[PDB]
Amino acid sequence: LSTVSGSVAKVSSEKLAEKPVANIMDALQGQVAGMQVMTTSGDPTAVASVEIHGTGSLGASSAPLYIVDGMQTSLDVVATMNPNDFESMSVLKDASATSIYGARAANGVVFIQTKKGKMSERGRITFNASYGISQILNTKPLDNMMTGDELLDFQVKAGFWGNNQTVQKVKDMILAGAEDLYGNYDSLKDEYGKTLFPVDFNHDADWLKALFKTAPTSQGDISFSGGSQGTSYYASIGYFDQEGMAREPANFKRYSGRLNFESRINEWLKVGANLSGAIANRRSADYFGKYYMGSGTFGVLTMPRYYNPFDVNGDLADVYYMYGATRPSMTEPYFAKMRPFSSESHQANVNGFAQITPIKGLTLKAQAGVDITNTRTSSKRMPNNPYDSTPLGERRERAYRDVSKSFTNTAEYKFSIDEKHDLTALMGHEYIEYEGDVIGASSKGFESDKLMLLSQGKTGNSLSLPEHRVAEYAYLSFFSRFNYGFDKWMYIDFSVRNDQSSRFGSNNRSAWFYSVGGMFDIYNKFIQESNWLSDLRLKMSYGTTGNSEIGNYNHQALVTVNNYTEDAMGLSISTAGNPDLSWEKQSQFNFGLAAGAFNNRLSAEVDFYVRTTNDMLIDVPMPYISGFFSQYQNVGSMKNTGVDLSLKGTIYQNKDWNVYASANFNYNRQEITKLFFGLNKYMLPNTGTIWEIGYPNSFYMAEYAGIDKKTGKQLWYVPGQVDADGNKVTTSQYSADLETRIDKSVTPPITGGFSLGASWKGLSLDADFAYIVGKWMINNDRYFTENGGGLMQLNKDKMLLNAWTEDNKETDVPKLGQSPQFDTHLLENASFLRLKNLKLTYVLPNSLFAGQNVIGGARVYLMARNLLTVTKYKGFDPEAGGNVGKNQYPNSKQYVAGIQLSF
Amino acid sequence: LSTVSGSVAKVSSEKLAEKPVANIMDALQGQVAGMQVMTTSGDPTAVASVEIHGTGSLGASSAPLYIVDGMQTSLDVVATMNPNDFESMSVLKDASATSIYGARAANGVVFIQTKKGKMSERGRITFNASYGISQILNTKPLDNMMTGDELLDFQVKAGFWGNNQTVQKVKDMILAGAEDLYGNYDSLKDEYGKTLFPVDFNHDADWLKALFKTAPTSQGDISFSGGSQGTSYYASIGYFDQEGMAREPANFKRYSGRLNFESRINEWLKVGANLSGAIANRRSADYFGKYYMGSGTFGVLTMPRYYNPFDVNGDLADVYYMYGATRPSMTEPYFAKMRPFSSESHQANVNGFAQITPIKGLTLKAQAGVDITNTRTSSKRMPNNPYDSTPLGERRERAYRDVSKSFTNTAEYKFSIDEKHDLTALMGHEYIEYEGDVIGASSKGFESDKLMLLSQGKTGNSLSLPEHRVAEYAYLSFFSRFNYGFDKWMYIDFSVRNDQSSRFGSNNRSAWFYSVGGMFDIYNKFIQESNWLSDLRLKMSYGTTGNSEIGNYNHQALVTVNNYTEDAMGLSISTAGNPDLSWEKQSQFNFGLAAGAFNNRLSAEVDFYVRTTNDMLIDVPMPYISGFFSQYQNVGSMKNTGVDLSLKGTIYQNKDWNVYASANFNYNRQEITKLFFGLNKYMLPNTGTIWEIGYPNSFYMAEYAGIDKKTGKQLWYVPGQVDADGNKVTTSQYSADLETRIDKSVTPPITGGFSLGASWKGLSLDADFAYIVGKWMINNDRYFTENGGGLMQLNKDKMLLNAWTEDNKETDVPKLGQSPQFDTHLLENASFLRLKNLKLTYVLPNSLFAGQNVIGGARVYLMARNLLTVTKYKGFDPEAGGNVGKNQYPNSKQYVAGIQLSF
Amino acid sequence: GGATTATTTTSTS
Amino acid sequence: GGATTATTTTSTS
């Protein structure tokens, strides 16, 4: 699986236990040193962002290589696998450990390994079940917003409604004398004022109750493990169902199956097959991240509190009202039942191997895998809707097929020469292939609910053009590694690899990589008689690795269709082309030290790494005068340097008690070395960041000083200039030359985590914490809720009432008619400490199952996920983001009770 | 699986051996008594027509119920299963045997059962391979056709070309002075007369070589069988590839996989899972059955022999020429490379069970199966074709998804009361469900080969409307049977069943069926001391069964879309509706006798059956004044009555020799009893058949007498009328009142087969014959090749040269200008005797594998399929047909050599 | 193909 | 939703 001198972190099955999410990488936030995992949505159909030893490139992806049982997969396919089938998870964060897997092995690989049946004479059955709820985890951002009449008085005073207008003249006949809108619709012209009050100036509408809910979560599973004299099997079926926390629907529901099987046919051949399948239903809330008027957390913060989405009985209405609108705005349940969507995906993973051992020593091994998924989605827009722009309805069907095949063949030969010189050779071949496909077809113009096939729409100007997409790639690799070992205390590993990809041109597709590593067992040679210490191994490595994750057709100079008339065709220039595109080459030096004391009762590991990346694939931004947005190129280089260290112990006292703890830490320092055009620095436009030589990608902002107490204007520091009294010079006119690079970082430098666990006679309690410090984020929601210049129709912060006037002069918030800039007062400290899980179990005593041979195990749980976070970021979530906090889906706080009957 | 008093025929694995076709039912033609199998194409993607005990209805389908391992499938899904995985095949042709399976169990069921691993301590590996060729099997129809110049002289004499024209004036400047056509195309205006002679009056173009070829066939397979102390497994992979015999392409190619697995978990539960998958590619020649000018066997018979599709070097050209045409006609390879087609289907069958044995006696059993298939096809029409009607190209994509789920749960309880009164009860539940779907989307207007996605076509009047189809059904059933048995010689079976279908209305969907059967072992009670006889069992039965195979929505009164303009929608009346539609109820009486002599060396079985069908679902033909074609209704009834008998033996002499034989026979007599409208008889229009009370569906024709020797006209017998001299009265004016029902049958009454097999020290030879007598067919191809009235442009029979003139008077073929009718001279005797397979194997001696423990078995084959047929039907195939022989795909004659290494 | 030739009989069963 | 409010910053990483 990996070398002996490598950097391997193995996570056991108990940390991959029942977790009530489909995103399995979020269960590893804080369990591996160096590997940092951050997810950006509480969406059930969300996929985590993993980075091992910092970011390695700027254009290509820095995701690891996810491998489930030899053949390599993607995280969406892993999301349809039952997590109760996984035996362990090895993370190989080295250049000598990742030397037989290569497609993006410079980012590290993640080896998921599935469970196999133990070989007892009586098989094992296990029935798991669970049920829980999920809620929003933060409410503090809407604790300092305005109320209804307070916002109306603030708007009337600031001159938004009129130049000479009062509160009653605005609230009476301008935006409450808009029964003129509700009197145009037959469904609700007799409900205004009777059971439907859309504008209510006396209460405050709870907009959090109208946009977010409490969502259930269920899972069930049943597994049969067994094994006779030669064969072994693990079969399993189960289902998972998670509902969306937000009122805009986004669920996840899968029915799974798994059959791992292994057998020894004779004394010469051993065969095996581990094959799985799934039927899955996804849906995503695709409005989070954009700023629409009444949607998301931006909608729970900014909607005025004198607009009522509820009826008189407390239920959610079908429509609400915003002033100036020409049709009523639909709420999220009505918009969900008038725009249906349904997906259905069928996934199958077939995977098999055969080992042949002809002579003593060498074993040949052949392995082949197929990964097929057929997805089929449907969308509607329902006819005869009164609050729509048309009485006609539309429909759209889509069919996806993604097929990925793989073949891999090794031949290992191990031997000794005299007594203590054990060599091992390994040569091998690897071929990966992929071919995807998308077909789509829509229709529109339907007038009935029942008559809505695609062949029943209008046939004139209501026709449209279908959809078709094709993608494909391939990889071919030849590798060989050699392990030499002395008697007990010296191991030396040497490996060569040739990689060829389909993503690069025919003269640049092949690259050669190598790795040399070593391990020295100091305890078994020098200090073999000791009182306290019990293990000491030193290990070091150096190897070069490639990265080839850009896109499939990024090196051709292409010409596409662009039709002008309907009589002839027309061609346009599509891309620019780069004939000299090739791999990105990362050389990593590693040096570690792994101790151990009190015979297992203190383990400590310390690592050091460099990881220099050359010929870095940047999607370089061409100037706008070329007519192209960007183009992939091999220009630039960027360094890292880091330490990471973990230590675990056991501090129990009595026979009954069992107390253990673990701690885990990583720090690194990014550094860019060469950009792309002879440039010293490059600022990414309206993102807030900058790439500079000798620094990480820092933030690039103006510095906010305060306000001017004599006139009320905002003030910014002039960079570089110092006044005569030592103070820094300010100015009140904004310009783009007031911006400078500030000493923050987009990628956080310090990650870590720590775990505690106590036990008793049965009753056990485990608590896991994760933390990230050094993380800053631009709070983009505070641009909208803390400005008096524009967007006065929305709800504002409560601090915009002590604004600078001619009477109120000693204050801190500026005058009204000013737009704010994106400067250092919108940059916030998003450094958090979470409580990831708090599982409390109680395995039932073995004396309870005495005469009955039908049962023989039972456990219960009381699990709470994300129930505590400590940070100083005021934006519903510090983890859900990365460079900005837009209209975001916050994470979930979940309470789950389960049961397990093992019999 | 079945009762002890039932009618069960078990076919072993050796008759399901290597057969080089994907159609597995054609391997059973002549092996089961009563079951007759007839296929109608040599197409690789063709599915056989099976009928057990005659045809049971007139409107609904009479196909059996195909069940592979408990859950019921269709023959197209069975075609993707490897036939080397099947252990046996039981055919249950009784009303007491088919009493736990019901959807169309009145037609009998076919139980395919897959192989399981034997429980030896060392597993078994088997590698099979094969290779063969396939040819056309008949050439005799084109042995009496005209030549080129003979046809030209016959056409010139008959006045087809001119009223006053000679042979040279026609052949010189009319249809050889058509270089005027080839001089319009740049690709072949300089090839006429140099390397391309389309009209050649000196040779005869072999049109059989231009339309049919010799096609290869390959298959390979590797299988691992094993079993330890509790578990058993059978894994297998393989592939099959068959090419089309005709030049118009129609192939079949599949990659298969199979994993059967069984295990005993503990002393209380036994689990199992048998799951398979396939990736398949189909294509069909969809022009056979229609009469186009240069296609099929009609094209090898009727194309004039002075049209040359070859060039001067013997290869097939791109185009040929027919006189009068305005563009050159494309040959089949060019039409195949200018109209590409490609299918890809992914099929998965997942199927699992669990038995629970809580107390002694009763076992509960749960079983669940899923059957998913995702098919995805693509078609093109290539641009820039010079011989096309447009320079623009088109494309069309399609996505199919068919998902079928099933659940079945039984609970059996068996016990004795004193010593010899063993009862057995069984109750059970069955639920079947199906939901299919078709999506399609096309585009047109492409101008380049490279730019052919669906989103790159024209956008005006070149748009089109997509395709969408949905089908779904369900079945729910509750059954229970009870077996009572006395000590050795008396068994009595009694069963009740309630069936509910989704295809009938909500007040008519549920029906109750029963069955009572008995078996008496006469040998173990009365004649237990005997000299020659060794077994004698008598058995009888009676039960009622349902049939519900009509269509999914055949009982609603429906209204569909029919658009007039492009501004509003428009509704039309689609079907008529029948609210009182329900099942079709068949009650079968059965009575058999199974003997046995010389202790196993003569087995004989004799059966007798009735099988009355009431409330028969007829798709009744409404009169044209109602505005509908037809409507399903429960009207009518039809009887059968039949005997069937089989006998097998062993007549070997020495220790080395081993000679065996088998014979098999079935006769039945159909009879219709009540039609639909108070009608006594109903003649199906321009099919040639009639449904009458008290007779089978016979043929309905006029009787051809001969010609008139004084004037040359055709002559037909007047039905009923007799002349004064005893001879029958003739007439020369055709009318529809000259038609009468003739004493033939559309369904053949007598079927059967017989097998011989000899053996030696290793070398073995098996030969299987099948036969069908009493079969008549209308030869529709002889309407075109034996008429002098119309269609004079085609090639004719050689007998149309002794036609009646004023000089040539003593002849038999009529005068020229007369059209023939469909009468008894086009009805031919299509009764055949085939030689189905002639396998000659030689298992290698065991002394050859002495020291090597790597091998330990090897067999070879030399197989010939369909190499001999004896019949008197002159139409390329007597089996490929049924009521007419149209432009048909003849069957194949195949030579296959294989090898098997068992080790 | 093209120019379908006529007077065929329909096929039931 | 509808009437998208503006002055947002683009997100890299």
What is the spatial distance between Cα B550 and Cα B570, in angstroms, rounded to a whole number?
Answer: 29
Closest CA to A374 of A344, A405, A406, A341: A344
CB contact A792 to D (< 8 Å): no
SS3 A181: helix
Q: How far is B702 from chain C (nearest CA, A)?
A: 15
Residues of C in contact with B791 (CB under 8 A): 5
Task: Judge whether A593 and A5 are in contact, CB under 8 Å.
Answer: no
Q: How far is B216 from chain A (nearest CA, A)?
A: 27
CA dihedral B720, B724, B726, B727 (to 10 degrees): -70
- Give the dihedral sign, CA B553/B559/B564/B569: negative
Task: Judge whether A634 and A550 are in contact, CB under 8 Å.
Answer: no
Q: How far apart are the first and last CA of chain B?
A: 33
Q: How far is A465 from chain B (nearest CA, A)?
A: 6
Structure tokens at A569: 């065709």
Per-position b or e across A259-276, b if 16+ CB within 10 A of its CB? bbbbbbbbeebbbbbbbb
Structure tokens at B734: 């055709």
CB contact A901 to B (< 8 Å): no
Residue with tokens 């917003």: A145
What is the spatial distance between Cα A299 and Cα A212, in angstroms, rounded to a whole number?
Answer: 11
What is the spatial distance between Cα A473 and Cα A469, in angstroms, rounded to a whole number?
Answer: 14
Burial class (CB in 10 A: 0-12, 13-18, 19+), B177: exposed
Task: Judge whether B756 and B661 are in contact, CB under 8 Å.
Answer: yes
Per-position b or e across B46-73, b if 16+ CB within 10 A of its CB? bbbbbbbbbbbbbbbebbbbbbbbbbbb
What is the spatial distance between Cα B391 and Cα B337, in angstroms, rounded to a whole number?
Answer: 16
CB contact B231 to C (< 8 Å): no
Secondary structure of A567-600 in HEC code, one letter for each residue: CCCCEEECCCCCCCCCCEEEEEEEEEEEEEECCC
Neighbours of B402 (CB within 10 A): 20
Closest residue of A to D11, CA-based? A687
Closest residue of D to A823, CA-based? D9
Burial class (CB in 10 A: 0-12, 13-18, 19+), B707: buried
In Å, how far are A380, A406, A448, B626, B688 from B570, measured between CA atoms? 21, 53, 11, 21, 40
Non-local (6+) Cβ contacts of B730 within 8 A are: B705, B715, B716, B717, B718
Picking from A41, A62, A293 by the largest number of D CB atoms within 10 A of its own CB, the best residue to mutate is A293
Which amino acid type is present at position B358?
P
Structure tokens at B63: 């196909």
Neighbours of chain C (3+ CB pairs under 8 A): B
Neighbours of A846 (CB within 10 A): 10
Q: How far is B127 from chain A (nearest CA, A)?
A: 14
Question: What angle (nearest 5°) sits at the alpha carbon of residue A270, between those of residues A269 and A274?
Answer: 150
Residues of A in contact with B267 (CB under 8 A): 122
Question: Between chains, do A455 and B466 touch, taking CB under 8 Å as contact?
Answer: yes
Report the residue from B55, B747, B884 with minimal CB separation from C9: B884
Picking from A256, A346, A442 by the largest number of B CB atoms within 10 A of its own CB, the best residue to mutate is A346
Residues of A in contact with B281 (CB under 8 A): none
Residues of C in contact with B790 (CB under 8 A): 7
Task: Judge whether B41 and B531 are in contact, CB under 8 Å.
Answer: no
Closest residue of C to B826, CA-based? C9
Beta strands per DSSP E along B562-688: 571-573, 584-597, 602-609, 612-614, 617-621, 630-634, 637-639, 642-650, 660-668, 671-674, 681-683
Report the residue from A291, A747, A883 with minimal CB separation from D4: A291
DSSP label at residue A44:
T
CB contact A118 to B (< 8 Å): no
Task: Judge whether B365 and B410 are in contact, CB under 8 Å.
Answer: yes
Which amino acid type is present at position B213?
K
Residues of A in contact with B350 (CB under 8 A): 257, 277
What is the spatial distance between Cα A477 and Cα A355, in angstroms, rounded to a whole number?
Answer: 20
**Partners of residue B572 on adjacent β-strands:** B560
Structure tokens at B460: 């005006």
Neighbours of B216 (CB within 10 A): 11
Question: Between chains, do B688 and C9 touch, taking CB under 8 Å as contact?
Answer: yes
Residues of A in contact with B468 (CB under 8 A): 397, 453-455
Residues of C in contact with B287 (CB under 8 A): 1
Q: How far is A36 from chain D (nearest CA, A)?
A: 15
Report the residue from A688, A746, A791 with minimal CB separation from D5: A791
Chain centre distance of CA B284: 14
Residues of B in contact with A269 (CB under 8 A): 125
- Give the dihedral sign, CA A850/A854/A857/A861: negative
Residue with tokens 């793989």: A406
Contact map slice: B 308-367 vs A, CB within 8 A = 346, 348, 350, 352
Report the residue from D1, D7, D9 with minimal CB separation from A287: D1
**Partners of residue A618 on adjacent β-strands:** A633
Residues of D in contact with A696 (CB under 8 A): none
Method by which the coordinates were obtained? cryo-EM
What is the spatial distance between Cα A614 and Cα B390, in angstroms, rounded to a whole number?
Answer: 54
What is the spatial distance between Cα A235 and Cα A302, in angstroms, rounded to a whole number?
Answer: 52
What is the spatial distance between Cα B437 and Cα B442, in angstroms, rounded to a whole number?
Answer: 17
Residues of D in contact with A783 (CB under 8 A): 7-8
The enclosing H or E element of B843 equals strand B840-843
DSSP label at residue A848:
G
What is the spatial distance between Cα B250 and Cα B246, in angstroms, rounded to a whole number?
Answer: 8
Question: Between chains, do A883 and D3 touch, taking CB under 8 Å as contact?
Answer: no
Residue with tokens 């469900």: B433
Do B and C have ≥3 inter-chain CB pairs under 8 A? yes
SS3 B298: helix
Task: Judge whether A607 and A590 are in contact, CB under 8 Å.
Answer: yes
Task: Judge whether B394 and B444 are in contact, CB under 8 Å.
Answer: yes
- What's this structure's resolution in Å? 3.3
CB contact A855 to B (< 8 Å): no
Residues of A in contact with D1 (CB under 8 A): 287, 290, 292-295
In Å, how far are A347, A900, B683 from A127, measured between CA atoms? 24, 6, 65
Residues of B in contact with A237 (CB under 8 A): 352
SS3 B139: coil
Task: Judge whether B261 and B231 are in contact, CB under 8 Å.
Answer: yes
Chain centre distance of CA A783: 26
Residues of A in contact with B384 (CB under 8 A): none
Backbone angles phi, psi at B716, to 5 degrees: -130, 145
Q: In what order do the strands lie in the sheet with A827-829?
A: A827-829, A776-779, A884-885
Expressed in percent and rounded to 5, the helix, strand and coil fractions of chain D are 0, 0, 100
Question: Between chains, do C13 and B883 touch, taking CB under 8 Å as contact?
Answer: yes
Non-local (6+) Cβ contacts of A176 within 8 A are: A199, A201
In Å, how far are B44, B84, B87, B188, B881 from B22, measured between CA atoms? 7, 12, 17, 42, 20
Q: How far is D11 from chain A (nearest CA, A)?
A: 6
What is the spatial distance between Cα B542 and Cα B556, in angstroms, rounded to a whole number?
Answer: 35
CB contact A158 to B (< 8 Å): no
Non-local (6+) Cβ contacts of A678 within 8 A are: none
Report the residue from B292, B689, B794 with minimal CB separation from C12: B689
Question: Between chains, do D13 and A746 touch, taking CB under 8 Å as contact?
Answer: yes
- Taking CB atoms and an 8 Å cut-off, how many pairs form between chains A and D? 54
Entry field: residues in chain B: 903
In Å, how far are B178, B210, B716, B791 from B320, measured between CA atoms? 12, 11, 42, 20
Non-local (6+) Cβ contacts of A684 within 8 A are: A690, A691, D12
DSSP label at residue A124:
E
Neighbours of A854 (CB within 10 A): 11
Q: How far is A844 from chain B (nearest CA, A)?
A: 22
Beta-strand relationship, B884-885 and B776-779:
parallel
Question: What angle (nearest 5°) sits at the alpha carbon of residue B184, between those of residues B178 and B188?
Answer: 85
Task: Judge whether A222 and A125 are in contact, CB under 8 Å.
Answer: yes
Closest CA to A495 of A485, A486, A483: A483
Task: Judge whether B547 and B632 are in contact, CB under 8 Å.
Answer: no
